[PDB]
């Protein structure tokens, strides 16, 4: 179970903890995608800023 | 609704709870006197002794001395030396005191 | 008018007018009732007018049922002073009312007289008003 993550919006003006989640996922630029293994320890990260991001399901 | 009897049985055993030692439980009826030692942590009684179960006849003072002298032996046979003495609501006098001397002369440590 | 004879404290904070009324939303006293809509602090100086006008309209009979009470003391500083130097002095006793409250219930009075009697309060009160008859929903709770 893998998930290709694609950022949709910029993190400007949003609280700092959400920025720390974006850094935990390793998002330093816009539109960058990354396929990550599906575990709740990483899914709970994306659940926070889900409104700024998009996720695709792979394998 | 509590009474002075239940309060006196409560307060002294509350004092004994901080000791954590093996408690010498005393129950004195009009006919007999009963004593079984329990572990307050795990709620398991070690051994028992009394006068009715030992088929005693008359005066509960010397009879209580007898039940002490009969209780302490099994304690020295199971390896129980350091102990405490709880009186409950009864005053430390007469029958219960003669029982205490029965245990101390029986070989316990209190 | 209305004011408590004794109180624990003479001053209170303003709180918040958020949410709907937690009680007094269904008619349980009289045939008809008046429900308020807008939130506001309701002074006894505002209540006495509606009450007095309604009993001046009845002139006998019927019963006025007040379901609220002015438990909120209102404060104000003296005129032409600076911010600070203590909190303003308490000059009135008001009541918090939010959407859903039924302040007044009336019985022993027929529909029409109830209609105009409840109509005077619509103007003599600052909040929007709505006239209700006690139906099965007010009887149910």
């Amino acid at each position: 179970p893998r998930l290709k993550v694609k950022l949709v919006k910029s993190p400007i003006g949003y609280p700092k903890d959400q920025k720390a989640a974006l850094k935990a996922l390793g998002l330093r630029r816009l539109q960058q995608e990354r396929v990550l293994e599906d575990t709740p320890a990483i899914r709970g990260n994306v659940e926070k800023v889900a409104h700024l991001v998009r996720v695709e399901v792979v394998e | 609704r509590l009474t002075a009897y239940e309060r006196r049985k409560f307060r002294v055993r509350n004092r004994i709870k901080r000791t954590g030692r093996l408690r010498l439980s005393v129950f004195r009826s009009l006919k007999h006197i009963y004593a079984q030692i329990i572990d307050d942590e795990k709620g398991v009684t070690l051994v028992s002794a009394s006068s009715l179960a030992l088929k005693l006849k008359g005066n509960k003072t010397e009879v209580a001395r007898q039940v002490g002298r009969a209780l302490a032996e099994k304690a020295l046979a199971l390896g129980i030396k350091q102990v405490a003495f709880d009186r409950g609501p009864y005053k430390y006098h007469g029958r219960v005191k003669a029982l205490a001397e029965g245990a101390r002369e029986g070989g316990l440590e209190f | 008018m209305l004011m408590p004879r004794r109180m624990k404290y003479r001053k209170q904070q303003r709180g918040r007018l958020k949410g709907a009324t937690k009680g007094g939303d269904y008619v349980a006293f009289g045939d008809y009732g008046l429900v308020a809509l807008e939130p506001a602090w309701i002074t006894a100086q505002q209540i006495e007018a509606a009450r007095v006008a309604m009993v001046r309209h009845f002139r006998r009979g019927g019963k006025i049922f007040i379901r609220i009470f002015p438990d909120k003391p209102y404060t104000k500083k003296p005129l032409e002073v600076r911010m600070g130097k203590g909190k303003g002095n308490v000059e009135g006793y008001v009541a918090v009312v939010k959407p859903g409250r039924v302040m007044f219930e009336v019985a022993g009075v027929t529909e029409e007289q109830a209609m105009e009697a409840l109509r005077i309060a619509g103007h003599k009160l600052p909040i929007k008003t709505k006239i209700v008859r006690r139906d099965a929903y007010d009887e149910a709770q």
Binding site: - | - | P78, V81, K85, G86
Partner: protein
């Protein structure tokens, strides 16, 4: 017109300093309270001002006994 208020006492930093499952050492303070809002359990030392400290080096665990109040227990690992 003047003020009669504005006077107050400093805060006492009241609460519990060690939670359930944490590592403690002999003498480390556990709880601060006024009166008996807690009651000492196993290996729970307490002084005169109701300061609860660690009696031994162990792990922390809490329980509520209902009418007898909440108790703490410091287990040997």
């Amino acid at each position: 017109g003047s003020t009669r208020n504005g006077r107050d006492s400093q805060a006492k930093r009241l609460g519990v300093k060690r939670y359930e499952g944490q590592v403690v050492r002999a003498g480390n303070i556990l709880v601060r309270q006024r009166g008996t809002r807690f009651k000492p359990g196993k290996n729970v030392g307490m002084g005169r001002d109701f300061t609860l400290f660690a009696l031994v080096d162990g792990v922390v665990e809490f329980q509520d006994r209902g009418r007898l109040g909440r108790y703490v227990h410091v287990r040997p690992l």
